[PDB]
Amino acid sequence: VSGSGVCAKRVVVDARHHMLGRLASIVAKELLNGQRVVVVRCEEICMSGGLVRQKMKYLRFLRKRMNTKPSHGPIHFRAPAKILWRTIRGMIPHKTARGEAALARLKAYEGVPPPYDRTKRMVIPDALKVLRLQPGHRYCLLGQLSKEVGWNYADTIRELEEKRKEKAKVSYDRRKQLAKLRVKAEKAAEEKLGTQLEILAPIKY
Amino acid sequence: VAFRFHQYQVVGRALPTPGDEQPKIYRMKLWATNEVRAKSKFWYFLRKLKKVKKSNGQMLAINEIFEKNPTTIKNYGIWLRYQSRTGYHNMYKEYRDTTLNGAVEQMYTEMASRHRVRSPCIQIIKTATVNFKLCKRDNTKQFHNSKIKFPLVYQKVRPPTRKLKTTYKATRPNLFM
Amino acid sequence: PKTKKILQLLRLRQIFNGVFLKVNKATINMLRRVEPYVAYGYPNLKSVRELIYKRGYGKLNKQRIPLANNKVIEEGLGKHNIICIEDLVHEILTVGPHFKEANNFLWPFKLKAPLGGLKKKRNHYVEGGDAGNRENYINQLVRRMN
Amino acid sequence: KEKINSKRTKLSAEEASKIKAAGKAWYQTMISDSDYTEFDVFSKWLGV
Amino acid sequence: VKGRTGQRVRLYVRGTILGYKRSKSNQYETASLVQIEGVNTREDVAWYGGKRMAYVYKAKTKSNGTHYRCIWGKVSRPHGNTGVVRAKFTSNLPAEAMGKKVRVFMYPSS
Amino acid sequence: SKMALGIKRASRSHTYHRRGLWAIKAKHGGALPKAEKPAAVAEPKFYPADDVKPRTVSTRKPHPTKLRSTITPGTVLILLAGRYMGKRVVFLKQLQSGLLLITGPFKINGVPIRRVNQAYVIATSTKVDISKVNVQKFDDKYFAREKKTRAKKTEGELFESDKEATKNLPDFKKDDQKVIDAELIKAIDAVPDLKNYLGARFSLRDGDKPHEMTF
RNA sequence: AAAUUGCCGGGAGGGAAGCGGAUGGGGGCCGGCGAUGCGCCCCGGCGCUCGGGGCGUGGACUGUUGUCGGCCGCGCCGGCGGCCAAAGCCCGGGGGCUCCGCGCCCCCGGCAGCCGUCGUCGGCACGGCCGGUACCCGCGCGCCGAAAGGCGUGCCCCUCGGGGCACUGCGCUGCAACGCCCUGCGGGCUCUCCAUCCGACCCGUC
RNA sequence: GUAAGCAGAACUGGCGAUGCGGGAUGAACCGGAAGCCGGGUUACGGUGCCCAACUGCGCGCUAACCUAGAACCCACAAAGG
RNA sequence: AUCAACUAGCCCCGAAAAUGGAUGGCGCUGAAGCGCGCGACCCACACCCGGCCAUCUGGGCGAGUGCCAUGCCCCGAUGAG
RNA sequence: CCUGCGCCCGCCGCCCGCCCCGACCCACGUUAGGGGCGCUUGCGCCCCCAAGGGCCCGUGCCAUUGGCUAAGCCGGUCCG
Ligand SMILES: [Mg+2]
Ligand SMILES: [Mg+2]
Ligand SMILES: [Mg+2]
Ligand SMILES: [Mg+2]
Ligand SMILES: [Mg+2]
Ligand SMILES: [Mg+2]
Ligand SMILES: [Mg+2]
Ligand SMILES: [Mg+2]
Ligand SMILES: [Mg+2]
Ligand SMILES: [Mg+2]
Ligand SMILES: [Mg+2]
Ligand SMILES: [Mg+2]
Ligand SMILES: [Mg+2]
Ligand SMILES: [Mg+2]
């Protein structure tokens, strides 16, 4: 992993059905390479090995605390966005100025808040579940783990997403109509211009 | 391209002594990754089978055996002797390959996989082209079926070359088998 | 200490130094005792020629003199009717009556680290490592250290 | 390029007979199998 | 972007600084590593071998009437398989320059 | 042929032919000439204490710079740098110093006749026909700068007056430009869109990969 | 004088600081920090040196390109040789298998389209670092040519191309073309502060 | 000697006296020994992130509801299922 | 169509300790685990090519236009403490 | 609540500083399946592999001196 090499102002990544470790590794190198990343829908991140293994792993994590001052001890986050951020922090040198700067470039959210709902959301093929996991091997959703370890905002994230997904689908239909009339325009204009568009025939698909 | 393994005839005999100006000549068919390793393994068997060491011996000829019809599919049997963690065993195998070199390469691979056996621990007794109608293993027989038909249940999603690699993509990959 | 002494006699006292040897029962039994430390094989015409032109240096009065020209050979050997670099090649390749003199004349070759790498140096060539006899395959290794 | 009699006859047919017969005879030698009828115990397992 | 304002021919390709030539315990500031936009194989970067590069930054005070400063370089050789190049500049790049952008030009053309 | 030429050059016979010791065997009869002894000055004005070593007027004769194979007259070049970066121009001929002589043409691009170093150019595939254009009036000294002194520091009085003055490009050079571009445009006017092509600049729109892009 | 302290100005700070290598930003300082002279010339006065012009030059430091060497790295393409080479391809022949993977498998003999492995020979394109000539190369001594470079005679060779050898002499012998700045908001600095990456445990002692 | 990072011997090498690369970390384990530099290439070891170098091309085995397992020395696991 | 023993790969049981906790960490499940391979690549103060400093070696310089001769120049190898 | 001599807001006159260099693009869902379009509302048709695509005067010395200007497109501003 070297880096995307892209000049985008930011890259919004829809983390649904990505693998936490593979996604975190890709995102971490991007942050080090100076890029800014937004990751949305972290409740939908997938983890290999079922819920039971992942619950056990997380409750071993709850055991670790400074015996004489637990508030100083390891800080156990419940929200999926914070689970993602600490997994990324594990893959960055975060005790240097350079790694502090890298972590600043990362924003992680549960669900798709504004303005990121009207933005195009990219996917990282190297971490997708369909390509990285063999159908029939246990996995859980990072939202599911948080629910069972004490994240009390699962339902509000669910309420908000349904209203957004409905609001996005009517927009799907509105563009669906606009796409069709534009298509008929394509023909109607492309017959108005005859040989004058001949140079495009062998390079079109 | 190259085959990792090659089949060799190796010919050799003891040194002519003040008696026996015509010592007896031996041959084997050996598998190795080059001539040098082929000659070395010849002198292994001929020390421990026919009691002639490389020192008191002489090398006569070494030739590479090639497949006659590489473009066709042959079934194969391999009789092999190997060493486990607690002894020695005899094992028989069936393979399908266009060349017998290809058949041997699979055999070493499945021994290192299914049994953790390394190449310095395997001796190939006998090799053969078992014609179909006499193949024993069930894996090899299910391919002896004209009207063979099956889907590709596993299919790699990857660009033609790394030139077209990206990190991000607009849409999810579209797969159907 | 015994391995150390033999490599001094073979004029190999630095890694990736190369020299030319005559086959002998006396010689082969010296390589058997230092084999983990050396790779060796049978050189051919191209390997013997390119080594001597490109990386050949003479031992004139205990000093390492590059064989940039033929007069160095004439003054180096001369007495043994070796006059040119091309007869110096011939003297080495077809082991001749003065192979002793024309091979001691050549200073030990100083070779590159092999372009493309080695396999495991710790094993014999037969095992898949690099030590020992690799008879004609030494020529492939010459191309990559020359 | 201009189809001069390239690689014209190096030798005659009868030599081409014995030449190709000889190498082919050396071919059966190379790929010849041992019978394996030395091993009474393993004769069935070996298939011979 | 319709009716934009800005410099309005692009004769260069964007590149980003990744750090210096490294081992896991040593660092060599004389050669920096540069990711070039759109190259994705070790054979694709033979095209850029030798091309000049410019790290353009802004200093705090004006000199010759501008705050802009530029240090020039060239692409030397590929680094790895995926299309990263070793870059050499007149001066070693700033350690804070990593994660920033460089301009890869076509000037010493072939 | 690099080595084949090299073998030919060092041939004992052929270097005799090359140097021309025949035809020097001619003048001075059945012999090869002698020489004499210069430096009979007998008039040192000074005597340096350093062990003197005089001025070099080198006899070494560096080979002329090579022209890239695809830079053939009439081909359209893209300028990669300078104030005309991106401009598409016409290649006329190589000059004596090796610099390429190019024209906008100035009617179309605004690029006059000028030298461009071959390094800063990418040759395109398209071809103009210029083998009825006359270019011998141009040579390297045409562009010879004849630069003046350092005394005219551009100062507040001088900043815009230089712009508001005109003592610059002289009358014959602007008359020259009209001669060539008038001839050039005829063959340019033959090719459709070739006039538009030169008036535009080359640009890297997003996703254009030079190592892929054929020109 | 130092330790240590106050005031003024400047700089930096998330549980040490200091340190070694890099460089970037600020400072502060550096005019031997960086040149304007030398050769032909025409006078007009004191062959030699100053006063005007005419004349070609010529200056720290640094920029780009070219061309020659040296070492290196990468990519492409072509020829030859060995093997029974086999093979696919085109033709011909040879064995059993019993409704079967069945238009089955294996085998051999001719030949004239492509394609392993091992060795070798050749050409070409790109790129990196160093160097710039007192000899090695190279130049003048003849002509042509802007310059590459070419131009002569005789013997040997195939016999196209053209090829190879020939007698050899005198001297000479630090590669170039353009730039930028020139008391400046310029150039650099081994000095000071700070930032960042990498490295980095406190010395003496047994 | 039940053994011990225990006590005593034989041959060789190392540390001590020695930096450097790797084994996360370590006096003696692996590579390798050194003037101050430029360029090239390697050894041991590696190429998901930390961390320079492929989420490279192949074939199998493993599914752990015990912290599956994952580095010569080396930081154990046995009889038995 | 099937039965019985045996055999050996990975997995599981056998498998208990005191601050909170360690395949180095995060993590990984057509692996980023295990075994065997194939292409490249990355990485030492080691090897190669070059400059420079020092050591050591071997040379050249008088009927001297000749020199800190305790000097300059040339050649080769070398450099830990 | 918001400093009676203190502050705030709006317009143009710009001048610096800052980022950038086309810094253009909203479906959900699954992948042993899905997508667009018609009519039995399920059937047909066509498409399924990568944004490897579309869009955009995309073309003027960050952009020459003046006039004119459809239809179309982009910005600021007014209102809803
Ligand atoms: Mg990396
Ligand atoms: Mg390499
Ligand atoms: Mg290795
Ligand atoms: Mg060892
Ligand atoms: Mg004091
Ligand atoms: Mg203060
Ligand atoms: Mg510091
Ligand atoms: Mg500084
Ligand atoms: Mg060169
Ligand atoms: Mg046949
Ligand atoms: Mg002591
Ligand atoms: Mg180096
Ligand atoms: Mg000495
Ligand atoms: Mg040394």
Short mmCIF file of C-alpha atoms (C1' of nucleotides) and ligand atoms in Angstrom, two decimals, chain G residues 19-22 195-198, ligand 7:
data_model
loop_
_atom_site.label_atom_id
_atom_site.label_comp_id
_atom_site.label_asym_id
_atom_site.label_seq_id
_atom_site.Cartn_x
_atom_site.Cartn_y
_atom_site.Cartn_z
"C1'" C G 19 22.11 15.52 22.16
"C1'" G G 20 23.82 13.44 16.65
"C1'" G G 21 22.54 13.84 11.34
"C1'" A G 22 19.15 16.48 7.46
"C1'" A G 195 10.20 23.52 13.43
"C1'" U G 196 10.05 18.58 11.43
"C1'" C G 197 11.80 13.36 10.14
"C1'" C G 198 15.32 9.71 11.50
MG MG K 7 17.85 18.61 16.70
#
